[PDB]
Structure formats: structure tokens, C-alpha cells
Amino acid sequence: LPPGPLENSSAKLVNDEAHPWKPLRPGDIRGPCPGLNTLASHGYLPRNGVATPAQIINAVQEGFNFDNQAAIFATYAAHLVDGNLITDLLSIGRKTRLTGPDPPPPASVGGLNEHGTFEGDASMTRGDAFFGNNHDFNETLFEQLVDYSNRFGGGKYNLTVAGELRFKRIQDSIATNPNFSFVDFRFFTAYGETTFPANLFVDGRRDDGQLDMDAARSFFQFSRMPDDFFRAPSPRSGTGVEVVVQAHPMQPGRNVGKINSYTVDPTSSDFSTPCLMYEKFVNITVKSLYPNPTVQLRKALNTNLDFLFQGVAAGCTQVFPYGR
Ligand SMILES: *[C@@H]1O[C@H](CO)[C@@H](O[C@@H]2O[C@H](CO)[C@@H](O[C@@H]3O[C@H](CO[C@H]4O[C@H](CO[C@H]5O[C@H](CO)[C@@H](O)[C@H](O)[C@@H]5O)[C@@H](O)[C@H](O[C@H]5O[C@H](CO)[C@@H](O)[C@H](O)[C@@H]5O)[C@@H]4O)[C@@H](O)[C@H](O[C@H]4O[C@H](CO[C@H]5O[C@H](CO)[C@@H](O)[C@H](O)[C@@H]5O)[C@@H](O)[C@H](O)[C@@H]4O[C@H]4O[C@H](CO)[C@@H](O)[C@H](O)[C@@H]4O)[C@@H]3O)[C@H](O)[C@H]2NC(C)=O)[C@H](O)[C@H]1NC(C)=O
Ligand code: HEM
Ligand SMILES: *[C@@H]1O[C@H](CO)[C@@H](O[C@@H]2O[C@H](CO)[C@@H](O[C@@H]3O[C@H](CO)[C@@H](O)[C@H](O)[C@@H]3O)[C@H](O)[C@H]2NC(C)=O)[C@H](O)[C@H]1NC(C)=O
Ligand SMILES: *[C@@H]1O[C@H](CO)[C@@H](O[C@@H]2O[C@H](CO)[C@@H](O)[C@H](O)[C@H]2NC(C)=O)[C@H](O)[C@H]1NC(C)=O
Ligand SMILES: *[C@@H]1O[C@H](CO)[C@@H](O)[C@H](O)[C@H]1NC(C)=O
Ligand SMILES: [Cl-]
Ligand SMILES: [Mg+2]
């Protein structure tokens, strides 16, 4: 019941008659992900910003040609930590009554806005949770993306710009955020996310990895596809992530309660240990939210954990927080 890959994955107009941009209505939810935000604001996703895992996987495939394996891993990771496992509903932003009754602690069901579950620090266009707003578009951070595009990309965002801006944001957070955390799941997502604008926001007829700043603003700020936008011509997600990782090689770590105190975490996964990243996500992060689930919640957890495993890096063994 995770959707499979697109039967037809060719480039096509996705800013079409059936999927017009509309402004936000009172109550509509938007969050820290410009990709899901754009799909909601073009009605690929429900325009209110509440969705099921299957709607999200269909929408990122249909609207952007996100690859099926990456869609499955990201969607079921997010739903396991931020979504209501009983109703099968996830907010793409703030915590809402609309996803169902607030679960017994320590589960949070906080939507994609929930800090430290999926969302984390050193986002390109969003502030760190520590500073009080982890989801709204930040013009100072966007201006920095434009500046790094001018410096390293001839005015366009590309994998070279991604490498420099990723490092600058890490350095920004080490210097200013006493609770800065850059380990395990966020260490992985923080690098992959910087490739998405080059791989997925670039018009599919061109697919040259060079994103112009008008398109960049339209997606990041307004959740809006360019006029006549064509999706990528094949499924992809994090192509070129190794280029960004190696631009300024980092060890995973955290500040220890003061600025400029970045301490390497030797227990953290990194890009050499993708199976450990999956193992710690399920056996520490998911387990911490659902330490002794009821019979009903245990069944929903195991179903969604089976789905998550379908998205894992080839070669990893399934991990069972609740046995089999
Ligand atoms: C992802 O996460 C999941 C967790 O979410 C991981 O899955 C878990 O993995 C752990 C580790 O394998 C499992 O823990 C093991 O559980 C078994 C079974 O426990 C149950 O059965 C025993 C025995 O019951 C029988 O006998 C009694 C009488 O004695 C009867 O009354 C019964 O009816 C049975 O016939 C019970 O004693 C257990 O009760 C305890 O636990 C329950 C529930 O918590 C309590 O309510 C009880 O009151 C009681 O406290 C239970 O019912 C168990 O036998 C294993 O114990 C052995 O290993 C532990 C840990 O040993 C290591 O760690 C310590 C440091 O903590 C260190 O000192 C040691 O040297 C080892 O490094 C020992 O403490 C025990 O003494 C015992 O040791 C013996 O056997 C081991 C070999 O395994 C050997 O090392 C020793 O030398 C010694 O001979 C153990 O606790 C979980 O069950 C499992 N959970 C699930 C859901 O599957 C998953 O691994 C992870 N994945 C990854 C990839 O990381
Ligand atoms: C598959 C389902 C997806 C989920 C669950 C998801 C979830 C998230 C979340 C929670 C964040 C916030 C992380 C952070 O920066 O703190 C994020 C960031 C991001 N996502 Fe998504 N996402 C998905 C798919 C996509 C797609 C398809 C795109 C591109 C079309 C995309 C582009 C981005 C970008 C660019 C960021 C970084 C924003 C920034 O740092 O300024 N995502 N995603
Ligand atoms: C958007 O993101 C930007 C960039 O990360 C945030 O900018 C930071 O905002 C804080 C204040 O809220 C500034 O802190 C101040 O620094 C001065 C001078 O060093 C000091 O006198 C004050 O005590 C205060 O701490 C900080 O300088 C600033 N950083 C940058 C690069 O501009 C911003 O808050 C985010 N949100 C919004 C709504 O823009
Ligand atoms: C990011 O943009 C910069 C600037 O366009 C690229 O560096 C240029 O690459 C072209 C190759 O087609 C060369 O003709 C120039 O010599 C380079 N100019 C500068 C200023 O370095 C870089 O290749 C781009 N990165 C990616 C991954 O596409
Ligand atoms: C796949 O999609 C494109 C739409 O851009 C279309 O031209 C092509 O015919 C489609 N293939 C099939 C078998 O329908
Ligand atoms: Cl695919
Ligand atoms: Mg963030």
C-alpha cells in the first residue's frame, strides 16, 4: 500500500489546468519542506496541508519525479515520528487537531514542524528551532542562498553552491545555536536536501542542474511552480549528495550547551554507515516516541516500519524495535 514507481516517468508539464497555484485559505498548513508545500499549493497534495503517506508518495512522484525508494524512506520516516499512526494522517507543518486525537505521551504527533524528529538545524531557508521559528521562509537566509549562487554558481544554484552553502549554515549554527545538533538522521537529510533544488526544481526540458533565482524564490518562498514548469525527465532524489558531503567534510556532532562547542559524536552514523542511520532511526528515535505501545499502536508501528524498510539502502537488514 506504499505506491509503486510511476508507470510513465517522462518529463511533462506539471503546472497544468488540473494543478493551478492558489493562495492560502484560513487554516491551510505549510511547513519546512518547500517540495511538499508546493505540491499542496498546486493541489497535488490536499491544499489544507494534511495528507496520508500514500498521498505524499503519489504527489512527490507525480509532481516532481521524486524516486520511489527515496519517497518511501522519507514519507514513512516522517509519518512514524510526526504523523498519527491510527488515522494515517500527517501535517506537512504545525501540529493540528485535524490529524486526530493527541496521542498519549511521549508520542508528539507534531507534524513536520516538530523539531528533532525529522526537521532539524542548518536548513538553507528556515531558521533553527532554538531561535523560535523552524518553518517559515527567512529572507536573510534566502539572500545568502542568492549570494552563494552568485559567488559559486554564476548566479544559479548548483551542486557547487550546495557544497559551500551547506558548510556556511553548519558554521552559522555552531557559532550561534547552543543546542545545535548534527548527528544521525539530520546529518543525512541536511546534505541530501541541498541537492533537491538542482535535481528537482530545474525544469525537466533542461535538467542541467542549474537553478535560476526566480524559480528558487517561487518554490522556497511562495510554494509555486514556475509558469509552464515541467517536472524532471526521470525519477531522482539526492543525486550528487557525495559532492556536497566532500566539499567541506564534517564529522557528525553537536554543540554541548554553549556556542562554538561542536563535539564529535562517535556513536553517530555518517555517509559510510547508512544501515546504522536506519537502525538508530527505528531503534532509538521511533522507539523513544513509542517505548511500550498498546496492541493497536504496535500493529500500526510494525506496518509503517515494514513500509519504511522498503525504502532503505540496498543491503541493510531489517531492524525490529517491537520484535516479530
Ligand atoms: C532493536 O531494538 C530491540 C529492542 O526494542 C532489540 O530487541 C531486543 O534485544 C534484546 C537483546 O537481545 C532482548 O533482550 C533479551 O531478552 C531475552 C528474553 O527476555 C525475556 O525472557 C527472559 C528469560 O525468561 C525465561 O526464564 C525465566 C526465569 O529466569 C522465566 O520466568 C520465563 O518464563 C522464561 O522461561 C526473562 O528473564 C526476561 O525478563 C526480564 O525482562 C522483562 C521485560 O523487560 C522484565 O519484565 C523482567 O522482570 C526481567 O527484567 C524476559 O521476560 C533475555 O533472556 C536476554 O537476557 C540476557 O541478556 C541480558 C543482556 O545481556 C547483555 O547486556 C548486559 C548489560 O545490560 C551485560 O551484563 C551482559 O554481559 C550482556 O552484554 C542479560 O542481562 C541477561 O542476564 C541475559 O544474559 C544471558 O544470556 C545472554 C545471551 O543473550 C548472555 O550474554 C549472558 O552471558 C547470559 O547467559 C535479553 O534481555 C529483547 O528481548 C529484544 N526485544 C525484542 C522486542 O525483540 C533489537 O536487538 C535491536 N536491534 C538491533 C539490531 O540493535
Ligand atoms: C518524500 C516526502 C518528503 C518529506 C516527508 C519531506 C520532508 C521534509 C522536511 C521535514 C524538511 C525539513 C528539514 C529541515 O530543513 O529542517 C524538508 C526539507 C526540504 N525538502 Fe522535503 N520532504 C519530502 C520530499 C521533498 C521533495 C519531493 C522535494 C523537492 C521537490 C523536497 C525538497 C526539500 C528541500 C529543498 C528542503 C530543504 C529546505 C531548506 O533547507 O530550506 N522535499 N523536507
Ligand atoms: C532569519 O535568519 C537570520 C539569519 O540566521 C536571523 O538573523 C539573526 O537574528 C538575530 C536577532 O533575532 C541577530 O542577533 C543579534 O545579533 C546582534 C549583533 O551581533 C546582537 O546585538 C543582538 O544581541 C542579537 O543577538 C543576529 O545578528 C542575526 N544574524 C544574521 C546573520 O543576521 C533571523 O533572526 C531569522 N529570522 C528572521 C525573522 O529574519
Ligand atoms: C556551478 O556553477 C559554476 C559557474 O557556472 C560552474 O563552474 C563553471 O563551470 C563551467 C563548466 O560548464 C566552466 O566553463 C567554468 O570554467 C566554471 N566557472 C567557474 C566560475 O568556476 C560549476 O561547474 C557549476 N557546478 C555544477 C555541478 O554544475
Ligand atoms: C508518457 O508520458 C508522455 C507525456 O509527457 C507521453 O507523450 C507518452 O505517450 C506517455 N507514454 C505512454 C505509453 O502513454
Ligand atoms: Cl523510482
Ligand atoms: Mg530545519
Helix (H), strand (E), coil (C) string for 204-273: CCCCCCCECHHHHHHHHHHCCCCCCCECCCCCECCCCHHHHHHHCCCCCEECCCCCCCCEECCCCCCCCC
Which residue from 45, 40, 51, 60 is spatially nearest to 311, judged by alpha carbons?
A: 60
3 state DSSP class of 213: helix
H-run or E-run covering 91: strand 90-91
What's the distance, CA 246 to chain centroid?
A: 21
Task: Please give the angle made by the CA atoms of 210, 216 and 220, to the nearest 5 degrees.
Answer: 140
Q: Structure solved using which method?
A: X-ray
Closest ligand 3 atom to 131 CA:
34
CB atoms inside a 10 Å sphere around CB 38 = 28
The annotation places the binding site for heme at 33
Distance CA(57)–CA(34), nearest Å, equals 15
Pairing of strands 50-51, 181-182: unpaired
Residues belonging to the binding site are 33
Data resolution in angstroms: 1.6
Q: How far apart are CA 201 and CA 214, in angstroms?
A: 11
Closest Cα to atom 11 of ligand 3: 131
Residue 192: closest CA among 146, 237, 161: 237
* Strand locations in 147-258 (E): 181-182, 253-254
Closest atom, ligand 2, to C-alpha of 60: 27
Going from the Cα of 68 to the center of ligand 6, the distance in angstroms, rounded, reads 4
Query: Which residues hold their Cβ within 5 A of ligand 6, which is an ion?
Result: 5, 67-68, 235
Neighbour order of strands in the sheet with 181-182: 181-182, 253-254, 263-264
Between the CA of 36 and the centroid of ligand 2 the distance, in Å, is 7
Angle at 94 between CA 255 and CA 86, to 5 degrees: 105
Nearest by Cα to 169 from 145, 134, 186, 138 = 145
19's grid cell? 494543478
Nearest atom in ligand 5 to the alpha carbon of residue 10 is: 2
Residue 198 and residue 209 in contact, taking contact as beta carbons nearer than 8 Å = yes
Max CA pair span of the chain: 57
Looking at all shown ligands, the one closest to residue 34's CA atom is 2
Tell me the C-alpha distance between 240 and 217, whole Å: 22
Distance CA 124, CA 189 (A): 12
Domains defined for the chain, CATH in brackets: 12-311 (1.10.489.10)
The per-residue b/e assignment along 5-29, b for 16 or more CB within 10 angstroms, e otherwise, is ebeebebeebbeeebeeeeeeeebb
Asked whether the CA dihedral 65, 67, 68, 74 is positive or negative, the reply is negative
